[PDB]
Design a binder for this molecule. Sequence first.
Ligand SMILES: Nc1ncnc2c1ncn2[C@@H]1O[C@H](COP(=O)(O)OP(=O)(O)OP(=O)(O)O)[C@@H](O)[C@H]1O
Ligand SMILES: Clc1cn2ccsc2n1
Length: 519
Amino acid sequence: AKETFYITTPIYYPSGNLHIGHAYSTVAGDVIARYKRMQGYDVRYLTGTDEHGQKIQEKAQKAGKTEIEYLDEMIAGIKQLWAKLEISNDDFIRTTEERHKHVVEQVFERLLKQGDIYLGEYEGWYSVPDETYYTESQLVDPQYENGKIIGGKSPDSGHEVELVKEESYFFNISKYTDRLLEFYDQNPDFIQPPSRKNEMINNFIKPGLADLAVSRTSFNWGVHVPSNPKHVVYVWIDALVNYISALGYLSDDESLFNKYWPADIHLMAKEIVRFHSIIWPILLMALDLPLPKKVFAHGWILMKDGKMSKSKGNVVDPNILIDRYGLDATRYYLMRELPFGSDGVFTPEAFVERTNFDLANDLGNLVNRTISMVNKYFDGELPAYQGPLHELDEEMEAMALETVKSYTESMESLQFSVALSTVWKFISRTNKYIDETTPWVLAKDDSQKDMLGNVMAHLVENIRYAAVLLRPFLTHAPKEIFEQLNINNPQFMEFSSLEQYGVLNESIMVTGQPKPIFP
Ligand SMILES: Nc1ncnc2c1ncn2[C@@H]1O[C@H](COP(=O)(O)OP(=O)(O)OP(=O)(O)O)[C@@H](O)[C@H]1O
Ligand SMILES: Clc1cn2ccsc2n1
């Protein structure tokens, strides 16, 4: 009955402590998941960790530990953070799990048996921090010896590349290039935003897709090729397979795979779009599998000196923000302050401005002001909604419905900051409604009691709209708001209860001890 929806985050390298950039992607994925569940979809939400390759082996070495004991410590920390952020992921995939490694072995042996993979020699350059191959001409700031280039830097990051010349299996991705372009034409929405698509076509596809080195013999940390055990599978081939291996693809139970694949959305930042939009669909074509419906690439959290990066160390730890300011404030800031298609700067001043003014004052004090007035003027018994009796009610009831409509448009196109600011236009206007109607003036005249009850009904109904719309974003405050107002019919917390204004048509006893909803 329920249509499926499958959403993934990238599997992040546990090469250091995760920062708010990683929290952004995972909270954004969590917001989409929660939103889609509330729309009545059968949702599966995957996240995980990319634990193989030269980068990880070098951090394990640097920590004075074996790879596996290093990894088990780091993953414990990452699992706690997602529990702390109240991420509603249905599974956590580790590339060191046997269920993943089995699939990587099978995929590689299949393509090798098909003849799509062949043995040869790679000669070129490699950035370990980017896990990316480069040609001589791609190098930034080359170092010359006696005419020959003997070093230089990655054009993506500026990290020092290293020389590689070794035996390596190759994947002939150039033969699929006509089909990939045809797929781009049949599916125009595939790469979001539109700007990254032109970036893919003109800087990778049009110049000519080189044959991809899919294995290496110079290090041991990764999945080994069963037919040639000296070879370790290239970390990006290993990693990309997590999205289907986590669904039991090529195992004795492919039920999740049959149900949820193809993925509806792959989330990521812009730097890994080429892996997910060129290499990934080509790998799927070679396995005769359906392609994902969409890859969404958001911008970066920026610092004083560019991209926030854990290898670099210009970082903000999400554990600090949650421990000090609370969960709702951290989730709210990330989704509100970074527009999806833009690179945004973190500042601690903007964080506390959002935490104090938007949450605690705008929303928090609206709920507190409202419950205080019902307690004073009606002794806790909220009067039932009747209709738009006040002169402002017709236009404000229309605004509530236009708010839900605009919110929906923003959520479907993943514009989370615009969705949130639309909700805050409505919250701000509800505070303004108290100031326009002046209930204290109405409470003096006992002929104006019906109008006073009407005003209170509109305040609580506006609050209910806001609380339902914020359920995908904030995990505590909506529940607290429903508790304090004493709305316990589960239907009135759902999206379908926002279609027609004024669902509270019985009198309700609100809380007599109204506390602040935000830490
Ligand atoms: N500054 C950032 N802003 C937004 N998302 C980010 C940011 N940094 C990392 N991410 C998220 O993590 C993914 C990259 O994972 P990765 O393990 O490479 O993190 P990293 O910070 O780039 O690591 P490293 O510093 O070692 O390169 C991105 O695609 C995105 O989902
Ligand atoms: Cl798949 C995949 C691999 N990888 C590495 C960093 S973020 C990411 N997603």
